[PDB]
Amino acid sequence: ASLHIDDIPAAIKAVKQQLRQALPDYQQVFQAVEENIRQQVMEIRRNLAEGKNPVPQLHADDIINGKVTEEQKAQIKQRGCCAILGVFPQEKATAWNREIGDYLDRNNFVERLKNANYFGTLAKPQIYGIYWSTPQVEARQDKRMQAVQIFLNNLWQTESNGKQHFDANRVVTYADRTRRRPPKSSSLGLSPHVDGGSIERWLDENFRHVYRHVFSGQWQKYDPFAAEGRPEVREFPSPAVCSMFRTFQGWTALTPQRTHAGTLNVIPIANAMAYILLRALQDDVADDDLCGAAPGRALSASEQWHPLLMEAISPIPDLEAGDTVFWHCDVIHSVENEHNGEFDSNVMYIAAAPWCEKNAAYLPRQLASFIDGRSPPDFAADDFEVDFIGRATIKNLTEIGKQQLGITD
Numbered sequence: 001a002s003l004h005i006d007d008i009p010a011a012i013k014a015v016k017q018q019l020r021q022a023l024p025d026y027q028q029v030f031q032a033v034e035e036n037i038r039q040q041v042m043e044i045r046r047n048l049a050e051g052k053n054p055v056p057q058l059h060a061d062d063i064i065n066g067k068v069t070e071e072q073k074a075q076i077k078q079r080g081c082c083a084i085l086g087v088f089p090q091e092k093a094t095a096w097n098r099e100i101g102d103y104l105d106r107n108n109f110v111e112r113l114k115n116a117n118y119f120g121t122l123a124k125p126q127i128y129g130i131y132w133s134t135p136q137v138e139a140r141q142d143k144r145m146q147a148v149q150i151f152l153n154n155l156w157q158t159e160s161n162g163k164q165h166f167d168a169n170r171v172v173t174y175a176d177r178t179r180r181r182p183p184k185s186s187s188l189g190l191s192p193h194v195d196g197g198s199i200e201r202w203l204d205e206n207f208r209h210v211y212r213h214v215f216s217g218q219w220q221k222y223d224p225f226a227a228e229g230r231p232e233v234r235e236f237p238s239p240a241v242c243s244m245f246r247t248f249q250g251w252t253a254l255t256p257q258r259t260h261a262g263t264l265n266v267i268p269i270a271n272a273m274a275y276i277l278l279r280a281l282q283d284d285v286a287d288d289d290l291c292g293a294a295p296g297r298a299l300s301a302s303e304q305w306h307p308l309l310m311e312a313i314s315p316i317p318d319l320e321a322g323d324t325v326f327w328h329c330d331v332i333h334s335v336e337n338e339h340n341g342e343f344d345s346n347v348m349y350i351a352a353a354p355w356c357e358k359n360a361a362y363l364p365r366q367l368a369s370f371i372d373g374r375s376p377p378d379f380a381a382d383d384f385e386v387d388f389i390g391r392a393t394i395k396n397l398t399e400i401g402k403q404q405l406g407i408t409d
């Protein structure tokens with residue numbers, strides 16, 4: 001279930017020499033993939049200079065009524081991201097914003113964090129280690145959020161070789177954190193990156209099965225929405241490991257989101273991973289390096305090794321309290337360093353996780369932390385909400401809220 005390598009630099013030299021032999025024309029393949037990424041980069045910059053946003057936008061009512069056309073789905077799968085509006089009523093989402101604020105003010109969350117290490121003393125928090133607020137629990141179990149997540153999961157190819165790699169019609173809940181960012185606040189440093197593994201995409205054999213069409217030279221056949229092999233990838237044991245397989249990451253806007261307001265940026269290129277994988281196999285890269293990728297860190301995309309992709313960094317469309325935005329698990333994303341806007345940028349991290357044997361194993365340990373009010377196993381054991389006034393319990397759960405947490409009822 002996990003990857004174990006003692007000497008990583010030596011393994012990189014061995015694997016790169018192994019990949020270069022199986023693909024002796026690795027430079028010819030890269031310059032053709034670069035041509036496919038270049039035209040997408042230029043198409044993205046055409047829209048931004050024109051007044052449009054390259055991130056596709058949909059309304060939740062269109063999804064629920066079944067009005068999404070096949071061309072809208074093809075644009076989501078090519079961009080690898082989607083902003084979905086009106087998932088929750090704006091009146092409730094704006095109230096959810098002030099409920100979490102009162103939830104933190106009531107239990108004195110600021111002083112608790114300080115009282116709970118010099119490096120811990122440094123860490124004005126903007127990402128909050130709370131997981132069981134009433135707005136968080138209620139939004140995960142909303143029927144409109146569930147229908148949206150079912151639609152996103154049905155964009156994937158779930159079946160191959162007589163095997164259903166996940167259930168796109170069943171949804172599980174992955175408890176995550178929340179973000180509250182005020183204007184003129186300090187940057188976090190979330191440079192363009194990809195979550196879910198870094199050098200493991202080259203070293204682990206299960207990862208190379210997902211990207212087998214890239215390493216074989218037939219890059220045109222690589223589908224970022226093919227589920228085969230993705231729940232079986234191995235990562236290094238690190239705090240940056242998500243125990244669940246998420247088809248789409250995403251959050252819900254508690255406050256209006258604006259450009260140059262310290263909010264999310266994305267590179268809307270679904271197959272950008274093909275460019276990154278073949279980039280590290282070129283000759284201007286040292287034999288022991290995979291373009292700065294490090295174990296235990298998110299796969300970084302920089303101006304030094306990927307100047308073409310940096311040109312396509314696009315802000316997300318303007319959102320209101322109640323709109324959501326999702327992006328593929330291989331999509332490069334980042335957060336604006338400065339918040340020069342007026343309204344704060346508060347979001348709730350709520351991804352889209354389908355049912356599979358891998359995700360089902362995480363539910364019992366996740367539910368145990370909910371009943372206790374502790375932190376989920378994938379996060380630092382802060383256990384802030386153990387004695388919190390107003391913490392959401394099982395009494396706050398609906399029938400959908402219990403089926404998605406593994407509760408049998």
Ligand SMILES: O=C(O)CCC(=O)C(=O)O
Nearest residue numbers: 179190195263264335347
């Ligand atoms: O835009 C945010 O709120 C954080 C984005 C991010 O780094 C993530 O969710 O992985």
Ligand SMILES: [Mn+2]
Nearest residue numbers: 193194195333
């Ligand atoms: Mn991230």
